[PDB]
Amino acid sequence: DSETVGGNQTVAIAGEQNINVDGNLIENIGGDIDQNVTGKIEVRSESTILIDADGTIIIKNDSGAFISLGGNGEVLIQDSQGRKIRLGGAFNSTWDLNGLPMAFINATSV
Amino acid sequence: IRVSQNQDNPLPQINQMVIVWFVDGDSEKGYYLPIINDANPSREKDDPVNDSAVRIEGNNTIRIDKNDSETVGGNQTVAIAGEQNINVDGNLIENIGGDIDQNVTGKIEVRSESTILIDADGTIIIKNDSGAFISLGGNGEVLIQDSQGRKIRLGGAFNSTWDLNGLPMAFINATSV
Amino acid sequence: IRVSQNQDNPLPQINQMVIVWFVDGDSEKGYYLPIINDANPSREKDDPVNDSAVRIEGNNTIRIDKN
Amino acid sequence: LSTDFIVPINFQVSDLSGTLRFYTIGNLVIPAGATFGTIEAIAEDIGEKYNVSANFIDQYSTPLTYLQYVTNIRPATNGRSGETIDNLIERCAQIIR
Amino acid sequence: LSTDFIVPINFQVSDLSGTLRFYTIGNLVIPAGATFGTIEAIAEDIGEKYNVSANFIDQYSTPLTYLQYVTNIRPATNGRSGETIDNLIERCAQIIRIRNPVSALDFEQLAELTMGEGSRCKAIGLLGINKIVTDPQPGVVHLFLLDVNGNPADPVTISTVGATLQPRIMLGTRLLISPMEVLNIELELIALSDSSKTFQQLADDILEALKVFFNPANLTPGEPVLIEEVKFAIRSVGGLSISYLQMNDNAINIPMPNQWTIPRFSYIGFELTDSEGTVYRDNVVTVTNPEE
Amino acid sequence: LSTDFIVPINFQVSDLSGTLRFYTIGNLVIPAGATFGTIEAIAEDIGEKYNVSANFIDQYSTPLTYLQYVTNIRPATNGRSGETIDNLIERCAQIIR
Amino acid sequence: ADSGSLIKVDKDNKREAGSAARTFTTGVDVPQPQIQKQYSNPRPEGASVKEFQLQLELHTSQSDLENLTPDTALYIENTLPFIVGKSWFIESVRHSFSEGIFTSQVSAYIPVAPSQGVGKLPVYEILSYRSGRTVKKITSLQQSYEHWRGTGGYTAYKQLSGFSSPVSYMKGRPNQLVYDFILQQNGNQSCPVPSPASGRVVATGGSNGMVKIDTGGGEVRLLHMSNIRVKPGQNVIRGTILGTQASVGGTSTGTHLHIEANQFILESYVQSLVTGNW
Amino acid sequence: FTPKIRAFLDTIASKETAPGTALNIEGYRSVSGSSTLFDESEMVAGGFPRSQGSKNIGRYQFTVIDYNHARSKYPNINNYSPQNQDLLAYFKLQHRNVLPYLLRDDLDNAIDKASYEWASFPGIGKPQGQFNQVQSGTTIASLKSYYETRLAYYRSLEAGSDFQASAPKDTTNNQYAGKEYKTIRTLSNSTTASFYGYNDGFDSSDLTANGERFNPEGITAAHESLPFGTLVKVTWAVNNKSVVVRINDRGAFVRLGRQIDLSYGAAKALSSPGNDAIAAGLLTVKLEVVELRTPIGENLKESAKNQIAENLEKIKKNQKELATPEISAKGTQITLEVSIDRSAIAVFSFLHTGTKHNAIISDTTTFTGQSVNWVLNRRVKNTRYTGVTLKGLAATITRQYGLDLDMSEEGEMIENISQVSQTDWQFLEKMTAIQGFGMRTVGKVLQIYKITVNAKKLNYTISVVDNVKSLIVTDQAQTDATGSSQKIEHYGGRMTTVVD
Amino acid sequence: GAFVRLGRQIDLSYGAAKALSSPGNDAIAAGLLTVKLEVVELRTPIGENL
């Protein structure tokens, strides 16, 4: 089956969409992807997951906690209260603590 | 005979019945249209009056020069035995009013070259069958756990925590602390 | 003339050929259907018998109330 | 059109009711590429009832190909059912002198 | 097309005005895959008014499937309304005296026959292959030919006339045949109109009179064109008074370059003035190209 | 075909022009499952003009069902408009001896 | 129906129909059945139209019995001027015999009196063939081998500039090269054979499918073509389908193509077969 | 101004314009021998630009002489506009015999003929073009290349992307055959095959399952399940050479996985220099199905639409038969004056339509004449009327024949009706009958009246005594069995129920 | 249109240009107008399905 649309394709489904593909799904998008989901997003694979972006990657929530894989190579792990673990985007490996204690448990031979 | 201009519908098969008109009554100017017979039986429908059942025994090719619209008041079910190839030159916008349950037997390759944004309101979990995962909690808790039970904890319930599970840690290539 | 009630298929273009019937033989009551000519040629197909090739030069709007 | 168009002589036109009918004087030749053309028309019969105002004639009975509309841009005039005796007498006298 | 096209016999074509109509001689078969095909057409009626220019006949009424265009690639020629009594007298007298083509005249009349009606010949004695008059070659007769179309003769026509005249020339004599040459005449007329004709009617009448005057049948090859004769031919139209006439940018008689050159008037400009002072200026080119 | 096929006797065939016409000698029975088979044909008229080369006859006027093509695998020969007197004399003399 | 161009078949006859002549057509509803492939139906003969009708009863004589048949032209004399001197077509003759008298009734009447080549073709594959050597695919005349000396050695071999093998030509005609090779279309040797040159077909068929073309300056000859589609006297252009390499009905169901033509025609023929531009 | 003419007019402007402006709009204001363009208002003011009397003006170098010569054929040229300059150039192409050679892509001859009009174009056999205004580097080949580039540019603008599955043909009766052998499906990517008929018992005496004699040298094969006559392309993987075989036999040996069995000739056809198919008993081949087809070409519906449109314009034209020249005294007027007591003479008029004569002894000539309505019933017409009353329709019909109309009532307004294969009298009869009217003819004038029980204005009374000789009164019962369909229409029978 | 110029698709008449004027905005005052061109056509208004 082949489908060629010289303009825009608009799909409006009031019910539930089921897609069952036995082969490979290849998506080549020449623009952007804006995915807005009101419910959950549960992705499951059983061989591998590959996430690649030439630029920056940000995984965040409304709580203000995020994992940022910088486009310059910086790595930033931030929690809601503002404690940060940083690696190296042309700086130093820094464990910013916001003036709060850090705990080691079952520490063996640090 | 066709209903539309640029429609080329599948032809009648051998031994199928058609109705033939003769323009100006000439036997040499005949125009046909297939009918429902037995070599041409009726397709199965839930509602024989309102439902549409179509089968194509060859390839199906639709080309639309202008925009396309599709409204489904119920469920849309797609079953493809081979590959699905989607090529969009513009932006792709999907708004889902429910959940997304994506089950893939093979790999998942996601490639972009500008930015990736993953955002939720609650918890985000990236886990494997090995029991190793990254949990970015909805309350701001951060958990980095491996298979054997070594975890780095940040967030709120506890303080900045590094559970080592009774295993030694290290700092290779260390200049200054 | 249409095959089903709620489809409004594209109309024949200017200079395209159609076949016309006259209800009760009246010249003022004519009903048409497009045919395959050269101003209305055949679309390219791998198998002309089983395959379906359709082109729309405008928008395509399909609305389905049920599944 | 790509070729010259001809509205034939004696082409019948009428008003909305169809009771008043005019006929073209001659052949009207609309040259290739042009769409509009003017000609003169004469009433079907004599009498003052054919003196009609502008934009009063808009129907033609015979449907010709590529012909869209017809109108009159001038009120019909000089429709008469016979001149007076005094005007005839004056005309006769002026011929004498 | 995937099949071979057929333009039927007697296919009618016409000019833009629609008054001149030509009909195809026979059926034309354009083989499948070709896009063009040529065939001869004949005028609807006799007369010199059908002698039209190239590409002047392109309108056709009956439509054929996939037929895109039709046009005459050759200017129609040999339109004749008839012959006068003196022409018929000459035709009768030549039958009286053509026994043994011996003089210049005799030779020319024979060559004009068997080459067509509307052609021309010029017979010159003792003219060698160099075409130089001062070197006479006894026993040599040189023929110069203008074909039925009014152009210098095609080699096939030369061969045909040679074969025709071979069993009629004196034994031992040498017959040379070559095409004729054409001298182009460009006219400029300044004349006063008496208003008895319109400017367009005057121009048409003058053009017709000059086309009659410069007919190769009415012209003697190698003889000078006399400007007084041209003025008389122009004025015989009537309804005008000639003020000035130029031929080839001068007012003097035009001598032909050699013995075998025929005049062929190509361009004429009109400047007609009436009593009221209206100046009508026009220009007509009659031949397709200088070397035609 | 699933059944035996019959090309009937006196079946008219011709060349591309249709001027030379042959007719089959008898019924041709193509057995079930077989597709392409052969039979003898005779010219419509006497004369040497019907002697034609192989692959020259390929048209048949009556369009029969399931029949696709016809050809001639031999050049048609022995078309004659009457023998010579000398050959007849020889034939007569040979009978005697 | 294929083009929908609404072609007209005859000059209209709007005689005594009205003064308009531009709003009506003066015809019927049912068209005539068209008989020819491309030509249109002939105009009504007119000799079937009666303009005069004459009833003739006469005392039967022997001459009026043997010479009075519908195949003769009647000439009635000593009568009205419009009857005298005209040929009357006998519609019918009747001979009655009620008693010793023979009576004749004659119904008679008077008839009314009076491009270089094709555009595009599918790509072909050309395989040079020799009786001894193996058949090899070629792209031009330069790569090939000359064919054998056929039935009396009409071939002679010369040496040319770019040919990788001796060039074969007819004896006495260096210009006229002769070759034997196999055409192919998608691997099929029963493909149609496009014409190698434009000209007039002068002779077809014969012992071995000889198509002969008169190009105006030379002759192009082709051998071993079956199912010839061109007739003698026909005009063909470059790329016209002259016939088939091998017939479908198993007429030995295999052979090559023999071609005699000059060097330029053969080179352009191979180039057009390979490229598809004609 | 198709792409060909457009490209040629560019090839002309490439050398006949001012430097730097060959495709620019400003090049339409070029001046010969000068890089300065003339006034923009001058090209529209009308006539010909007077600002430079002697110099050549325009994109194509023209003077007032060429302008007048063009106006001799195209009088609509009133000013010197880019459209008007293009039309003048097209006229010059027409007159110099450049169009016939340009329309069939003979660019050498087209340039040769155009060299007589434009001095910058070289001629055939002379790179001076019968003049000496040919610049350096200007040759016929360069002009051809420029024309090809311009034509390609013009064609690329309206280049489509659809494909055509059919091919144009001149006539519906005419038919054409396929030209390409298209692969349909792949029977087997790789299967083992063997050849039969070589050093075996299979000779020309055997019969194939087709019913044909076996030709071992033929390109044929036996397949297990394909129908006879199926064309199978067999490709040998060793040399990548493919040959099309025709399935005729069914095969005797079954073996395992043996779909096809080639003949000896078919196997020999697979051999290539250095690769002998017969050398290897078993060939690993690929099987495909091919079929005769029409090659798929570019869609030409856009050109076909233009062709249909121009044919539609051309068919509507005066192509009728001329009047027949018939010198005779037959069709004249018959005027009859008749009286019975010489008190008054009654006059009637008819048209002569027939004549009879008995010649032998009974010198008798019989003349027959008919009313003028016979003129209306002579020719069958096809026409349509819309928005016309009964009186208007009758008036037009009578005016078509020079008759007079006498009808007091206008009648109803007919909105849409078609006269299909009917004479004018028949159409008038139908229209008057459907409205309850009837016609009558006297002399030249046709009168239309209402069919009412009280319509005879004058009354004439006679007595049976002393005047009449016969009187037969008849009465019949109405029935649908007899009469015509119109008779039962006038009775109760009618289609009362109709569909909107 | 007589003048061709560059990028000139339309040329309004004097009355058409005057019809574009509004209180405080004279179209004739500005020789060149930056305008948007659309094609309109007589139509039957789209109503609720009955």
Author numbering:
A (entry chain E): 136 to 245
B (entry chain F): 69 to 245
C (entry chain D): 69 to 135
D (entry chain k), F (entry chain q): 99 to 195
E (entry chain n): 99 to 390
G (entry chain A): 601 to 714, 736 to 899
H (entry chain C): 101 to 600
I (entry chain B): 351 to 400
What does the primary publication say about this deposited structure?
A-1(L) is a Myoviridae cyanophage isolated in 1970s9 that specifically infects the model cyanobacterium Anabaena sp.
The central spike locates at the innermost of baseplate, each subunit of which adopts a conserved structure: an N-terminal α-helix, an oligonucleotide/oligosaccharide binding fold, a consecutive β-strand domain and a C-terminal loop. The two interwound tripods are surrounded by the trimeric hub, each subunit of which adopts an architecture different from the previously reported hub proteins. Besides the conserved barrel domain that is commonly found in most myophages, the hub of A-1(L) possesses three extra domains. Using in vitro enzymatic activity assays with the commercially available lysozyme as the positive control, we found that the endoglucanase and peptidase domains of hub/gp15 can hydrolyze Anabaena sp. PCC 7120 cells. Six gp16 subunits adopt two conformations (termed gp16A and gp16B), which alternatively anchor on the hub to connect the internal trimeric hub and external hexameric wedge. Moreover, the N-terminal tail (residues Met1-Leu20) of gp16 runs downwards to recruit the heterotrimeric wedge, which is composed of two gp31 subunits with different conformations (termed gp31A and gp31B) and one gp32 subunit at the periphery. The insertion domain (residues Glu81-Gly180) of gp31A inserts in a cleft on the hub, whereas that of gp31B stretches outside to hold the LTF.
